[PDB]
Every structure is written in C-alpha cells, then in structure tokens.
Amino acid sequence: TDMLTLTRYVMEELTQLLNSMLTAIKAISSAVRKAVKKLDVLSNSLVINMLQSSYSTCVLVSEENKDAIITAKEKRGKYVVCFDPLDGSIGTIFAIYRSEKDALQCGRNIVAAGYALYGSATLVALSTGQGVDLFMLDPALGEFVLVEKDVKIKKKGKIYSLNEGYAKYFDAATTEYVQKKKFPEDGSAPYGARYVGSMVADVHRTLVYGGIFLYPANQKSPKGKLRLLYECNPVAYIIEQAGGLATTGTQPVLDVKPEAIHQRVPLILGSPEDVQEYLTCV
Template identity: 50%
Template sequence: MVNALRASGKTAVLVSEELEEAIIIEERNRGKYCVVFDPLDGSSNIDAGVNIGTIFGIYRVKQDSTGTVEDVLRPGSEMVAAGYTMYGSSANLVLSTGSGVNGYTLDASLGEFILTHPNIIIPPRGKIYSFNEGNSMYFHSPVTAYLKSIKYPTPPKSPYSARYIGSMVADVHRTLLYGGIFGYPNDKKSKSGKLRLLYEAFPMAFLTEQAGGIATTGTKRILDIVPKDIHERCPVFLGSKDDVQDLMKFYKEAPES
C-alpha cells in the first residue's frame, strides 16, 4: 500500500498504523495529499474468517508546506476525504469526499467497484449497540449507566440487540446501514481509549457525520480534536443521532468521568 501511494505521485505524507514514523515522500514523487491509514483493521480476526478492512483519511498539504508531519496533525474536520474498504463475502468500498457517503461493491468480473449504496443515511435511531462488554468491569459510570438503560429499558420500550464483531470496519459498516451505536470508550484499563485518532477515529467520524450521525468522545466532537501525535488514541462513540445523544446525556450528568 505504501509503495502504491508513493508511486502514484499524488502523496506527500503517509501515516500507517503499522509504521512508527510518518513517511515523507521524496521530492520527485511528491504530490499535494497526505494519506493516513490502518492497512488491515481487524487483522486478529483473519483466521476466523471475519470481515476485516482498510481505513483511510486524506488531507491536502497546507499552503506553503512541502509536506511534513504537521500536515496531518490537524483536526479531522480538515480532511478532504475518508473511507474504508471491507473484505469479506464481498469487497465493499465506502467513501465520502465531503458531500455525503456512497457505498460501492467490487464486481470481480469487471474489476471495478459498482455504486450499490448511494447516499447512505444513518437512521436517526437504531436498535443495535456494539460495545466490547468483555471490558465492562473497567467501564466508567456513564457508559455502564447508558448500557443498562438500553438493555433494561422502561416498558413498553424494547431492549436493544447486541452485535459486536471486533473488527471496527465491520461494526461501523453495520451501524451506518442499520443505525444504532458503536462504542469503544476509554476506561480504567485504557486511560485514553484504544482506537487511534488519526486513522481510525477521524475517518469513521467523518463518514458518520456525512451520513447524518454523530461521532463523539462522550464529551466532545471527535473531528474537533487536534492530534499531538500520529498514533494518539481516543474514546469513540458513533452512530445514530438520537442514540449518541442519549449516551452523551449520561456524560453530562457525570462530567468527572
């Protein structure tokens, strides 16, 4: 992936989850875009045949810059495009260039991605929550209280269904299509959260907002965060507008968490 991006002549800075340092493209191949990516999200699931994917975000090099790491240490709201490709029973590309979200499916006979999910809009409320509840003993009180509220709702409301794959691409893809909420909070064990801000949280937050949803840390908009490090982590909650707003109410009631 690095070699292909370098050879394209379109990129100036590359940041990969697999590489400790950013790659600054040599002048003869340098373009005007910076690409941040997780080349194989959910790789621990490969042997089990679970869907995995590639997540990416794209910035334009700042004016008067020749391409440095500072060009990617910017809020996610400054990305010009973001998306992911999911590999499973089919290969799906979900992409936004800032004017909505479209989904494409690979037609292997043509070798082309065909538009199959135009103008993806997240339902305002879903019926699915996606959290790794194996970490429940470490969750802070707002998350615990929120999960209790959707698992044991006041009648006549029905409880939400749990769906957690453990591959962010697959879990977010389902959330975009069906609605609900995906969450990977910070907790007593992972103080800053587990997901990487630049090439996991930002692209997925960008897509979520473009599809009409909300992406937050619980207390602030993810796309407003200014990264200090290319591998910085952050808590992530994203999905249907009403569901995420419900979660945020619990954080407002317990701001110390």
Template identity: 50%
Template structure:
C-alpha cells in the same frame, strides 16, 4: 406476458427445426429466460463505477486538475490487491505471524505486512502524496521530491487482522488531508483536527468487497464485481437511521467502564420507557461493526476505561475517518468530552475513546456525560 410477433415467429421456427432434428424443443420459459438475460446484460453497460463517480464529482469543481481522482484510483488499486490477497490468504500461506511487532505492540500478521507495503507503494507511486501515516509504521513517511504531491493520507492497512484466521470481515481505513506547502511539509501538517479532512473511507473484505467513500458530499458504497474487476455503485447516498436497535461494544471490559458508559449500556438492555431492548452485536473488527451501524443504525462504542485511560482506537486513521463518514451520513460522533472531529491530535498514533452512530443514540450518551460532569464523577 404477450410475445411480440417477431419473437413468436422465431420461437415457432425454432420449435419446427428442433422437431425435424428430433431434439427436445425449447420451452417458452427458456426463451424468455434467455431474453431476460440479454436485457440484464444490456443494463450492466450503464454501471456507475467508482472512477466514473470520482470524475463526476471532479466535474463539480472546474478548478480541479484531477489530482484527487488519480490518488483515489491508486487507493482503489491497493484495495483490489489486498482483497485478492485476503481471498487466497490460506493458499498463499499468508496467514500467521510475520515474527515482528508493530509500534502498537501488536504482533504483525504476514497479511498486515503485505497490505502495508502495497498501500505505501501505491500511494507513493501516485505522485500525489506528500506525507503518509500508517498504523504499521512508527514514523510518518515523507515522500521524496520527484513524487511529492499535495495530499496527506492516514491509513490502517488491515484493521481487524486478529480475525484473519477465522474468516471474519476485516478492512482498510483511510483519511485524506490537504497539505498547504508540499515542499516544506512537517509533522505538524499531519496533526490536524478531523474537521480539516477532505475525504475518508474504508474497504471491507468479507462475503463481498465493499468500499465506502465520502468526499464531503454524502456517503456512497461501492461493491467489487470480480467479473469486471471494478467497484460498482451499490449503496448510493447512504443515510444512517436517526435511531437504531443495535448497540456494539466489547462487554468484556464492562467492569472497567466509567459511569456514563455503564448507564447507557444498562439502558440499552433494560429500557425504562417501555421500549424493546436493543440487540448487542459486536464483531471486534471496527470496519465490520461500523459498516453494520452505518447501514442499520444504532451505536458503536469503544470507551476509555480503567485499563485504557485514553481509549484504544487511533485518532488519525480510525476515529477521524469513521467519524467523518458518520457525520456525512447524518449521524454523529463523540469522544466522551467533545465532537470527535474537533479533537486536535498531538502525536500520529494518539488514541481516543469514541462513540459513533445514529444521531439520537449518540445524543443519549452525550446527555449522560453532561449529567456526569455537572454532578461530578461518581465514587
């Protein structure tokens, strides 16, 4: 690499001065390294933060008053707070049981309780929410008049919390709806099909803190830069591969599966078309499993079985947001009976089976269910 004349001049003077002081002379390599560092810093000044991204999206809608951008900024603040708490959970003695049980009958971790409080307060204080539905609260939360806005947010404040103690990635999941009449909101306004969702996302707390978001115009991933305290766009316009080499399911439940699920997993292990078997990857944290599926392709399965006839994952704040993201990324989702987003929930904590991921992989299991229904259930 040729150095510009000014750089040669500076380097020569530096070498001469260093020699006069009888100090070690800097090498050309060290000089170039410093120059590269300066160039890298210059590039860092043109970063696409999640706030800047939201404002750009807002600019595409001249009628927008910025309400959604403000709401998103409060969600982002909640994610930053929880990310910090997760990173120091052991030191802060946040690991362990809080001594209470949530509406799902699951023992609450201290970090669960803290995360729920953080998001409830952040969302209410935004002044843009009307109704909140959280996994940790038995009833929906209706925001008081002075702080009431036009959005409903359904969220799981800390998905995969059973993995806290062993350091596995966990996360926050959220879905956002618009309420027609904020002054007369009822529970019926919350029980909308996923097709009415206007935005969805998740924040994964792991080796890095990653927030994946869709506002109905594709899917983008942002990674938290701790030195800046900002989420930076690192995964623009995420598209899931049309077919994948990974399937993700809890095979410990295999004895209770229905025939289509069992046949599909058997095909993953022992394909009859001469192709290579799929690899099994199952973490047990929905955010982590779906994130991997979104980036690498494949399929995530949580079917109904003999123990959980209605499945286990919750519709409003797990199934719908993840299905929304998958469809926006070019994949699809399926309940075993219908497109997941077309399901109409009848209660806020309703559960559903779910198969989501690469378009081709979900098509395969849809065809198995179609064959099952045409021939009748197996004995």
C-alpha cells in the same frame, strides 16, 4: 435481461489518489480471499507504494510505521494520507488531507475518507464531503461498482455494540448507558446487542442498520484503544456525512486536535439520537 452497460463514475490529483487507494484495496482484497503478520506487511507496502506512485502525496501515516513517511521529491503532490492498511471480516481505513505537522490536522480538515470491508463481497464506503457512496468490488472487471448513493443512517436505531466483557472497567456513563439499553425505563423493548470485534465490520453494520458503536474510555485504557488519525477520524467523517454523530464522550472526534500521530481516543458513534442519549449519560 442479463445485460448491462457500464459508465465511468467520479466522486464529485485527488482523483488519481483515490484511484490508487482503490487499486491497493483491490490487491488487499485478493490477498485476503486466498489466505497474519505477513498479510499486514504486504498490505502496508501495497498501500504505501501505490499512494506514492500516484504522484499526489507528500506525507503518509500508517498504523504500521512508527514515523510518518515522507514522499520523495519526484513523486511529491499536495495530499496527506493517514491509513490503517489491515485492521481487525477485516478492513482497510483511510483519511486524506491537503512534515509530520501536516498529518496532525483536526478531522474537520478531511477532504476524502473511506473504508473497505473484506466480506463475501468487498465493500467500500467513500465520501468526498458530499455524502457517502457505497461501492462493491467487481474483481472480474477490477472495478468498484456503485451500489448506493448518499447513504443515510437512521435517526435512532435498536442495536448497541461494545465489548461488554469489559464491564468491570466501564466508566460510569458507559455503565449507565448500557443499563438503559437493557432496561428501558419508558416501556420500550431492550436494544439488541451485536459486536463482531472488528471495528470496520461493527461500524459498517452501524451505518447500514443504525444504532450505536462504542469503544469508550475505560479503567485499563483511559484514552480508549482506537487510533485517532487512521481509525477514529475516518469513520467519524463517514458517519457524519451519513447524518450520524461521533464523539469521544467529551467533544466531536473531528474536533480533537491531534497531539501525536499514533494517539488514541475514545470513540462513540452512530445514529444521532443514540449518541445524544449516550452524551446525556456523560
């Protein structure tokens, strides 16, 4: 008909905080569309200033800052935000929790988390613990429009995603799992391989098409590469809320007790039957 009506949507102080996080994403999206270190600096300040100005925060941890950032008394609220303002088709990642101690909570304590993916469209996956909703940025309105409710990942997919150039450094389980995806012993076709090299792009594909994404421990990086607070926990939260699994290989990512704010952990996530099969290799 070419005609629409619009209706305010609410994820069922946290609202003001998400509002401001989305407002930062909107600004980050416009800066990316018109573009390296400068963008990182700009992204970081947009997020820090909007979150603080929300009057909902007390502690932030940023990928870009050595130490946690304590919100001034006047603007102080009850929430803790861990985020990676520009990661990597690049992205932004964040997790929200209710001192530094307050950002070192297990992922299981997350109250909301999300990621933004800056592609031909800017997409946000968001969850407040009642499932995952996908939104697309409408930059003419400056508003995020709901495109899919309660997104669920496939039980089992047919794509595996990891840097296979690190083969010589793989741990035994990874070597075994990859061998199984290429040479299935049960008569089935081999999995296809995809790896963009930007974690949010790879995680997003994993959510919408199914399969598995891995950045496991290896010989060079025995604790993995990806960061527990503001990369692994938020995507583990999103993927679990969509019915998938996320493991370090030895325990669920959301169960790891953080020991420092820039701690790294291995990450294997995706369709639950693919992750379970990885775990059997471990």
